[PDB]
Amino acid sequence: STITRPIIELSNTADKIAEGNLEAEVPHQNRADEIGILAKSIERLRRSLKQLADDRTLLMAGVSHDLRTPLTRIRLATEMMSEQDGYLAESINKDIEECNAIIEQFIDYLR
Amino acid sequence: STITRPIIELSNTADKIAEGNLEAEVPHQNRADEIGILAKSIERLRRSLKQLADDRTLLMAGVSHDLRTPLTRIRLATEMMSEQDGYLAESINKDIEECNAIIEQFIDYLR
Numbered sequence: 001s002t003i004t005r006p007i008i009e010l011s012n013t014a015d016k017i018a019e020g021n022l023e024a025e026v027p028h029q030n031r032a033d034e035i036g037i038l039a040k041s042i043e044r045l046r047r048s049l050k051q052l053a054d055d056r057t058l059l060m061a062g063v064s065h066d067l068r069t070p071l072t073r074i075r076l077a078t079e080m081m082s083e084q085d086g087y088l089a090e091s092i093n094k095d096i097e098e099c100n101a102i103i104e105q106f107i108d109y110l111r
Numbered sequence: 112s113t114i115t116r117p118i119i120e121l122s123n124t125a126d127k128i129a130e131g132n133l134e135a136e137v138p139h140q141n142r143a144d145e146i147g148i149l150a151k152s153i154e155r156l157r158r159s160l161k162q163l164a165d166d167r168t169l170l171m172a173g174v175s176h177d178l179r180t181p182l183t184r185i186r187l188a189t190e191m192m193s194e195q196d197g198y199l200a201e202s203i204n205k206d207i208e209e210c211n212a213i214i215e216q217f218i219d220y221l222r
Contacts, residue, residue, distance in 0.1 A: 007145045014152035018159050034118045038149075041125035045156040048129050052163035056170070063174070066213050070206040074185070077202045085196045091188040092203060095181040102177055 006035050014042055022050045060110060064103055071096055117146055125153050133161045171221075175214050182207050 009027045016024040026046060028039035075096055078089040120138050127135040137157065139150040185207055189200045 004145065007149060011145075011148045011152040014156055018152075018155040034115065034122075038118060038122050038125075041122045041129070042156075044129035045125060045153075045160070049156075049159050049163065052160065052167070056163075056167065059167075059170075063213075067210070070209050074203050074206050077199050081192075081196050081199050085192050088188050088192050092185050095184045099178070099181050102174075106174075 006031075010035070010038055010042060014045070017042070017046050017049065022046065022053065060107065064107070067099070067103070071099065121146075121149060121153060125156070128153075128157050128160060133157065133164060171217065175218070178210070178214065182210060 006028050013024065013026050017026075024046075026039055026043045028036050029043060030036065031039060074092060078092050081089045117139055124135055124137050135157070137150055137154045139146050140154060141147065142150055185203060189203050192200045
């Protein structure tokens with residue numbers, strides 16, 4: 001009956017990982033027999049999920065940062081234009097506004 | 112020895128998923144006993160990985176497509192400006208080129 005338990009513990013841990021508890025430590029990792037190998041495989045699955053999560057987060061940050069540089073430069077350049085070319089500057093102003101709007105929506109929804 | 116086999120088969124399938132085989136079918140899924148419950152746990156982990164993969168793909172495509180619109184608009188407007196503000200137009204043109212470069216780099220790394 002004692003051997004029955006580590007099986008239940010392994011299945012339970014897998015559930016915790018899938019539900020979004022990436023920090024939940026897998027049990028029976030120190031075991032050397034077939035059970036401990038099963039524990040190791042669950043750890044491998046945990047690593048995959050954790051990596052994919054971190055990738056998405058860092059992706060959002062990197063894109064927004066790099067975009068900030070070109071956007072700022074354009075707005076300043078349009079500010080320096082004379083009134084005679086205002087109607088053309090107004091167009092580029094509309095574009096930069098739309099771009100900032102799209103980025104804002106993405107960050108708000110994404111937790 | 113017969114009982115030893117399914118444990119190895121389960122561990123092997125989990126390893127296949129971790130190494131990038133999201134389509135690797137889990138064995139002993141239809142079992143109802145303790146081994147069947149373990150099979151169900153492995154399948155749930157597979158679903159998590161597959162979901163995260165689909166998320167990354169859709170995210171990349173959506174952002175790049177929408178960005179194409181504001182870029183094209185600024186390009187046309189800057190071409191209409193008079194020579195008196197040519198030096199200002201040149202800066203905005205350089206900026207939009209930079210943006211296109213960033214998008215190309217992302218796709219090239221992950222086709």
